Amino acid sequence: RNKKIRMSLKKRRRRKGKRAPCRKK
Amino acid sequence: AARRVGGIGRRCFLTLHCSACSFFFQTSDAIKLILTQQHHILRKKGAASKFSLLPLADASLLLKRRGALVLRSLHGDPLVGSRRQRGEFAPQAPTAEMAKMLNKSCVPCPRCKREGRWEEGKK
Amino acid sequence: MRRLASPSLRRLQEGQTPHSMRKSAVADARKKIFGYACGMPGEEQWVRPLQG
Amino acid sequence: DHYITSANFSEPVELLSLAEDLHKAEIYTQTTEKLEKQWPAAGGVAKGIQGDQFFDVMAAAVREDLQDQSRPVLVNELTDHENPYCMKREALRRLVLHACTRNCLDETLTDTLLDRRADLQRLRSKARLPPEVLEPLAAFVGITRFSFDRRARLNQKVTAVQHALRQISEKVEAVLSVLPENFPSDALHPHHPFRNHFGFESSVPYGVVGSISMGKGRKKIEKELARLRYPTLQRVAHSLPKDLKYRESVAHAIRVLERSRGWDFESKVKAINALVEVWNRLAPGRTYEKILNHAFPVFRGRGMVKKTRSRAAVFNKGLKYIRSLTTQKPLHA
Amino acid sequence: TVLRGHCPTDKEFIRRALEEEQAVERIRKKLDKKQLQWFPGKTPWAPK
Amino acid sequence: YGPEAPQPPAGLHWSWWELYVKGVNPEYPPRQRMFAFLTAQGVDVLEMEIREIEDVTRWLEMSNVYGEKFPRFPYDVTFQDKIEALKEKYPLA
Amino acid sequence: RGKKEKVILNAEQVATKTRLPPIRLEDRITPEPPATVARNIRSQISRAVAGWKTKRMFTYRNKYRLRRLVGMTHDIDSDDEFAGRTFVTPLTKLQHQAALPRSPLHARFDFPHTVHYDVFWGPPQVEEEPNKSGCWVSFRVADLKLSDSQEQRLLDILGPERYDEQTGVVCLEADVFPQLNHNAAYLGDILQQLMREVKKA
RNA sequence: ACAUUUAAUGUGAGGUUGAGAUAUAAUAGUU
RNA sequence: AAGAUCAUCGAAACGGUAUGCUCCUGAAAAAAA
RNA sequence: AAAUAUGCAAUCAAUA
Ligand SMILES: [Zn+2]
Numbered sequence: 001r002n003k004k005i006r007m008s009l010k011k012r013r014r015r016k017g018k019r020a021p022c023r024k025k
Numbered sequence: 026a027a028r029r030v031g032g033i034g035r036r037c038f039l040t041l042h043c044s045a046c047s048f049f050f051q052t053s054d055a056i057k058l059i060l061t062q063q064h065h066i067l068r069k070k071g072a073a074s075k076f077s078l079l080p081l082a083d084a085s086l087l088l089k090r091r092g093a094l095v096l097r098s099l100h101g102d103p104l105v106g107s108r109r110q111r112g113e114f115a116p117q118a119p120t121a122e123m124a125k126m127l128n129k130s131c132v133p134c135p136r137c138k139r140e141g142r143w144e145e146g147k148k
Numbered sequence: 149m150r151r152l153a154s155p156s157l158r159r160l161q162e163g164q165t166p167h168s169m170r171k172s173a174v175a176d177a178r179k180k181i182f183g184y185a186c187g188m189p190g191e192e193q194w195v196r197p198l199q200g
Numbered sequence: 201d202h203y204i205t206s207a208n209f210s211e212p213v214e215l216l217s218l219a220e221d222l223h224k225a226e227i228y229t230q231t232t233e234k235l236e237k238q239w240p241a242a243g244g245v246a247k248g249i250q251g252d253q254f255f256d257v258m259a260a261a262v263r264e265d266l267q268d269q270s271r272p273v274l275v276n277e278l279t280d281h282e283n284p285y286c287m288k289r290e291a292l293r294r295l296v297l298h299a300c301t302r303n304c305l306d307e308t309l310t311d312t313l314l315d316r317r318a319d320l321q322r323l324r325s326k327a328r329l330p331p332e333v334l335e336p337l338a339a340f341v342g343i344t345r346f347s348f349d350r351r352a353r354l355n356q357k358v359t360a361v362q363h364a365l366r367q368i369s370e371k372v373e374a375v376l377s378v379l380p381e382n383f384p385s386d387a388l389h390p391h392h393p394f395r396n397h398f399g400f401e402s403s404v405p406y407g408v409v410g411s412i413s414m415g416k417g418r419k420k421i422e423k424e425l426a427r428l429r430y431p432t433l434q435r436v437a438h439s440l441p442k443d444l445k446y447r448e449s450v451a452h453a454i455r456v457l458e459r460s461r462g463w464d465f466e467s468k469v470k471a472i473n474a475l476v477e478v479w480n481r482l483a484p485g486r487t488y489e490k491i492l493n494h495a496f497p498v499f500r501g502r503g504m505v506k507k508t509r510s511r512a513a514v515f516n517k518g519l520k521y522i523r524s525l526t527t528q529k530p531l532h533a
Numbered sequence: 534t535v536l537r538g539h540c541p542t543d544k545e546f547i548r549r550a551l552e553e554e555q556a557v558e559r560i561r562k563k564l565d566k567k568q569l570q571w572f573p574g575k576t577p578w579a580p581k
Numbered sequence: 582y583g584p585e586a587p588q589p590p591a592g593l594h595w596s597w598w599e600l601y602v603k604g605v606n607p608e609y610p611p612r613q614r615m616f617a618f619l620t621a622q623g624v625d626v627l628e629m630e631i632r633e634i635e636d637v638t639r640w641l642e643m644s645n646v647y648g649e650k651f652p653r654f655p656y657d658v659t660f661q662d663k664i665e666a667l668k669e670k671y672p673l674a
Numbered sequence: 675r676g677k678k679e680k681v682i683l684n685a686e687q688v689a690t691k692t693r694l695p696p697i698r699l700e701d702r703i704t705p706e707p708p709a710t711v712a713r714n715i716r717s718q719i720s721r722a723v724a725g726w727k728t729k730r731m732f733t734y735r736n737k738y739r740l741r742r743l744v745g746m747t748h749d750i751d752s753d754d755e756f757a758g759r760t761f762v763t764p765l766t767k768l769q770h771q772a773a774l775p776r777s778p779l780h781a782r783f784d785f786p787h788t789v790h791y792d793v794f795w796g797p798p799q800v801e802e803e804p805n806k807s808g809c810w811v812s813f814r815v816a817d818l819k820l821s822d823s824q825e826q827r828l829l830d831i832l833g834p835e836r837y838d839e840q841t842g843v844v845c846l847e848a849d850v851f852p853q854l855n856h857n858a859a860y861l862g863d864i865l866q867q868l869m870r871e872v873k874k875a
Numbered sequence: 876a877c878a879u880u881u882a883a884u885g886u887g888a889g890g891u892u893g894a895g896a897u898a899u900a901a902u903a904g905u906u
Numbered sequence: 907a908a909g910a911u912c913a914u915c916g917a918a919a920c921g922g923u924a925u926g927c928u929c930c931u932g933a934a935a936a937a938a939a
Numbered sequence: 940a941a942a943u944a945u946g947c948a949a950u951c952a953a954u955a
Contacts, residue, residue: 001108003922008908013104015032015907016116017039022028024922026946027910033946059744066743071754074493078739081498091499094928098733099740101929103577110930114571122187122577126744128171141167177831177871181864183459184764187576188452189738189747196574197462252778332793332854336809340789340858342774342782381776394762396769396863402855409798413631415589415596420628420670430856432765439881440759444750447759452748458765459850477708482715483889489749491889495723496735500927506726508937521896526687553788555954556843557812564835564847572931579746580738581930655697656710713891720890724902728936729927758878767876840955 038104038118041127042148048136049147052123056100057087059132066130120145214276218298221274222291229284229323231270239263245329249348254357260350285323289314331403339399339429345380349403356380392434399429421466431465433458436472445485450475602626602634611642622664625671633667765860772863782866787813789861791854808849809857811865814842820872827875831868 003024010020031037042049050058059066060081067076086092103119110116127143134142156166185191204210239259241248248256271282276294281287292314301307314320331348338346347353360380367375376382385395408414418426425431433454440447453475457468482488522531534541575581584605587596597606604612615638619626626634640652640660652660683691706714722731741747750756762770775782791809815825828844829837837844846868848861 004908009105011908012115014028014030015036016104016118017031017037018104019030026912056740059740063743070745070751074489074739074742074749077493077498078743090927095498095736097928098736101578106930107571108930110571113566113569117567119577126578126746129746130744141171173871173874174827174830177827177868177874178833180764180768180871181831181868184452184455185459186452187579187746188449189580189741190449190453191456192574192576192579192581194453194456194460194463194574198464198467250778330793330795336791336854336858337789339855340809340811340862341778342772342859342862343778344774346778394766394770396772396774397766399855399859411597412601413598415587415593416598417590419630425853425856428856429769429859430765430851430853432763432769434763434766437763438760442759442880444755445748448748448750451761455764458763461850461852474708474711478712478715481709481712485748486750486752487889488719491723492719492735496727496732498736498739500729500732505728505937510937523896526684526690528681528684551954552841553812553843556838556841557790557810557845559838559840559955560812560836560843560845561810561847567835578737578741580734580741650694653694653701654704655701656704656707658704658707709891717890717893721894724890730936733928759880761878762876771876 037147038116038120040147041120041123041143041145043134043137043139044142044144044148045134045139046137047148048134052103052119053096053100055123055127057096058135059127059130060087060096060099062132065133069131118145215299217275218291218295221276222288222295224272224274225284225288225291228270228272229288232267232284235263235266235270246334249329249334252346252353257350257353257357261354264350283327285320285327288323289320292317292320335400335402335404342396344385344396344399344429346400347403352403394434396429397432398427401426425465433468433472436469436476439476441476441479443479443485446479446482450479599627602629609638612638614638614645615641619667620673622668623673624664624668625673628671629667637663637667768863768867772866783869785813785819785869786817787811789858791858793854807852807854807857808847809854809861810845810847811861812843812845815844816842821875824872824875828868828872831871 007022007024010022013020014022026033039051039053040049041051041055060078061084063076063079063082080086081092081095083092087096104116106116124143124145128141131140132143133139159169185195207213239262241256241260243251245260248260268282271280273280274287274291277287277290279290281290293310296310296313297307301310335348338348345356347356363378363380364375367378385397386393388398406418407416437451437454440450450472454472457463457471460468463471519531524530540547584600587599589596600606601612603616604610604614612634615634616626618641619629619637629637640663643652644660654660654663738747742749773782789809789811792806794803794806796803815828818825818828820828832844832846836846846861846865848857848864850860851857
């Protein structure tokens with residue numbers, strides 16, 4: 001899907017409490 | 026606070042803590058500890074399906090991709106599911122399940138070497 | 149009479165810690181009152197509602 | 201529709217029949233009022249039901265049976281309404297529709313006309329108490345010798361009294377033994393030697409008022425489940441597989457299905473019946489464990505998976521193969 | 534009681550009933566939210 | 582002439598279920614045949630469901646109007662097995 | 675749009691023709707017997723072991739191994755257990771051990787509480803209103819008036835979800851059956867068992 | 876909670892009308 | 907919820923096509939550099 | 940100051 005939505009899901013995980021990188025690698 | 030990993034509410038959906046001490050970790054660390062402490066678990070329980078996972082008791086083997094990928098397969102993505110799992114249906118913390126598994130396995134706490142405890146969240 | 153030994157002391161010989169006893173009693177009460185949904189293999193099929 | 205030939209179908213006869221039906225409805229309402237004044241229920245209907253006194257039950261049953269006997273049978277309606285409010289309102293509505301509506305506005309204002317009648321307003325708050333007001337409360341309390349229906353409760357009490365009198369003629373012991381309350385719950389049915397399994401039948405209406413199955417009645421399992429405090433899966437908790445793993449699995453399945461919504465009782469019974477036989481005729485769990493563990497080691501090596509060719513290569517390369525032993529148009533032409 | 538169209542029951546009785554209702558509503562919401570699932574019957578790490 | 586009056590089960594003045602099961606209303610000779618066959622076999626048709634009644638009606642009509650080879654069921658299931666199951670489930674009073 | 679070419683069946687085709695039609699979905703409507711279920715399971719397992727495997731199978735087996743190691747499976751120990759078929763189900767046990775009042779004048783609870791249930795009424799309808807079969811009981815621990823240990827046991831047993839701290843209220847729900855009477859009876863039985871367990875504290 | 880067992884279960888052997896043409900005895904004796 | 911405020915590392919340190927191992931759904935998204 | 944340790948939506952005080 002869209003890169004922006006993928007980043008949004010990663011940010012949601014971070015807010016939930018999982019430290020995941022935001023780099024689009 | 027811009028990118029602090031707690032949300033505004035300091036959510037810790039993956040954190041687990043021991044009630045006997047101040048030790049606390051997350052689900053991936055719990056899985057790694059379970060794989061490392063097979064001998065204690067097997068002794069308490071007491072070529073074979075029971076011991077098939079013993080090779081994974083080596084730190085170097087787990088560090089190697091041969092073991093790291095097994096670790097990541099066993100510990101999946103509880104916070105990642107289907108796209109329809111949003112809004113009211115967003116994933117919940119599996120900390121309760123992890124704590125129940127740890128307590129039933131009687132894995133020892135690294136900091137106090139106890140047997141039970143291991144409540145959910147962070148103390 | 150005042151017996152020195154207590155029921156807890158007598159039980160401690162077997163190896164039942166007070167914390168373990170408390171947790172076991174709580175778990176037994178919860179299983180009696182709520183159910184046996186312990187997430188065993190195949191439990192998803194039984195917990196999943198039908199749709200026929 | 202042919203012209204009128206017999207006066208039976210003439211309009212004045214229809215008006216007379218409607219008037220007679222309204223008169224019968226008024227007579228029924230008067231009779232209900234007279235019965236209410238003649239056999240009042242002290243303390244309120246709900247309190248009388250909860251107390252469960254013999255006199256209160258007898259009076260309520262007598263009043264109900266007298267009302268049932270006195271309820272008329274009208275000509276222009278095929279619905280024998282037990283509520284005088286409903287009967288009177290329907291009669292008034294039928295008469296209004298027949299010979300009181302000038303136009304669509306009147307046909308729509310008929311309901312407002314009915315609702316604006318003071319007598320109907322008074323009768324509106326005099327209907328019978330639905331069973332569900334107290335039946336769930338009684339079930340929660342744990343009363344098994346109970347019935348929301350006054351006539352049924354009176355029948356039960358009177359049967360118990362008759363049986364006690366049969367012995368009333370070491371005698372108090374025999375009388376108490378014959379008394380209903382002192383009967384073991386295990387002995388109610390041979391196949392369920394456990395207590396607190398049978399409850400009181402609910403008086404809530406059941407069935408389909410109108411359909412191709414208007415008078416079908418309850419189903420085989422519904423009849424049984426209406427007579428239990430709450431269902432249990434003890435029927436299938438026997439003859440489990442001898443294999444220990446399969447026995448544990450089926451026991452866990454039964455325990456979980458006992459407390460599970462979305463599954464019908466018949467569905468659970470059939471699922472257990474099929475699962476037991478499936479496990480019985482399957483191979484040993486330990487043998488399956490060994491075979492699967494040997495076939496799928498912890499680490500996946502190269503060449504351990506069946507090779508798969510591309511879909512385009514397998515199929516999308518033109519006509520190359522047809523499977524037919526007897527075909528008049530083979531691929532050779 | 535004195536005023537027409539008003540509930541005749543005791544105001545303290547109404548207060549206690551309302552507080553109980555609010556408490557049970559909070560409990561119901563908490564239980565429902567905890568037990569809600571999009572894929573009912575699934576537990577993490579169980580054979581999927 | 583005319584159809585026999587229905588027998589109210591209990592506390593009723595009519596029953597469409599009996600007429601439907603006997604195939605009198607709506608009139609359906611295949612359903613009448615199904616009712617007669619089940620009664621002869623010893624199955625309480627009145628206790629059956631609509632689904633089972635329709636299934637038996639279809640099976641009987643197919644068998645009558647196509648041959649004894651039909652109907653054909655998978656997994657080596659047989660119409661005799663179906664009839665035995667129905668008889669066991671709904672004994673005739 | 676024209677007619678499809680007509681093929682005159684050969685004597686060989688007529689002689690080697692199936693005497694019955696293939697199984698249809700109308701025939702599949704009939705459920706699969708347990709013998710066929712077991713045979714299909716055995717065939718699939720045998721094929722997979724024979725070599726039609728996949729990486730998902732290996733991952734699933736590793737996850738199952740982890741579950742067994744943590745002890746959340748039905749595997750049986752070779753020495754601890756290997757070296758009954760009929761049992762009383764938990765709900766039947768609850769019913770059998772439950773104590774019921776002799777008459778409506780006898781109370782088996784003895785503490786303040788409120789019982790709530792929902793009923794649906796309206797004009798004639800063909801479909802039953804969903805979500806109208808559950809019932810619950812609410813009470814205050816202070817009203818229950820237990821010792822500190824018993825109160826702690828009650829709170830721990832009922833969990834934080836069934837406990838509202840603002841008003842010190844606690845609620846127990848029962849929506850296990852589609853019938854309100856059955857749910858109420860089950861609720862009463864579980865409440866009595868809960869009180870017994872609390873007193874065990 | 877106080878809770879084995881309705882009758883059989885033999886060969887190493889687990890696949891009960893085969894999930895199917897297209898080079899390797901590969902697999903559940905050897906090949 | 908993000909784009910926030912604040913405060914660091916900082917320029918192809920951009921871009922993310924591509925790449926066998928891993929995860930989710932489902933009976934079925936397989937093999938593969 | 941022996942008070943707090945502080946980011947914001949798209950429903951609900953006729954009930955949080
Ligand atoms: Zn610790």
